Amino acid sequence: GFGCPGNQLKCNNHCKSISCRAGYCDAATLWLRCTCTDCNGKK
């Protein structure tokens, strides 16, 4: 991911730093990855 496990805010900040709104750690992967959800960069 990019912070997890034990770093869900790091994914949001990382998603906000990259170009998104807020992400989350694959809750289906025991929270490890750092996915990005909702982004403001389309058309």
Curated annotation (Swiss-Prot):
GO function term, MF aspect, one: lipid binding
Key words, A-Z: Antibiotic, Antimicrobial, Defensin, Disulfide bond, Immunity, Innate immunity, Lipid-binding, Membrane, Secreted, Signal, Target cell membrane, Target membrane
GO biological process terms on file: defense response to bacterium; innate immune response
UniProt key word Disulfide bond: yes
Region called Binds to membrane interface, residue ranges: 5-8, 26-32
Known tissue expression: Expressed in the mantle. Low or no expression in most of the organs analyzed, including hemocytes, heart, digestive gland, and gills.
Coiled-coil regions listed: none
Localization annotation: Secreted; Target cell membrane
Cysteines engaged in disulfide bonds, as pairs: C4-C25, C11-C34, C15-C36, C20-C39
Superkingdom of the source species: Eukaryota
Induction: Constitutively expressed.
GO cellular component: extracellular region; membrane; other organism cell membrane
Binding site for beta-D-GlcNAc-(1->4)-Mur2Ac(oyl-L-Ala-gamma-D-Glu-L-Lys-D-Ala-D-Ala)-di-trans,octa-cis-undecaprenyl diphosphate: F2, G3, C4, H14, C34
Principal location class: secreted
Miscellaneous remark of the record: The Cys-26-Pro-27 bond is in cis conformation.
Record remark on domains: Has the structural arrangement of an alpha-helix connected to a beta-sheet by disulfide bonds (CSalpha/beta).
Family stated for the protein in its record: Belongs to the invertebrate defensin family.
Function: Antibacterial peptide mostly active against Gram-positive bacteria (M.lysodeikticus, S.aureus, and the marine bacteria, B.stationis, and M.maritypicum). It acts by selectively inhibiting peptidoglycan biosynthesis through complex formation with the cell wall precursor lipid II (1:1 molar ratio) thus inhibiting cell wall synthesis. It does not disrupt cell membranes. Is noticeably more potent than Cg-Defh1. It shows no or limited activities against Gram-negative bacteria and filamentous fungi.
Protein name stated in the entry: Defensin Cg-Defm
Species assigned in the record: Magallana gigas
Part of the whole protein covered: 23 to 65 of 65
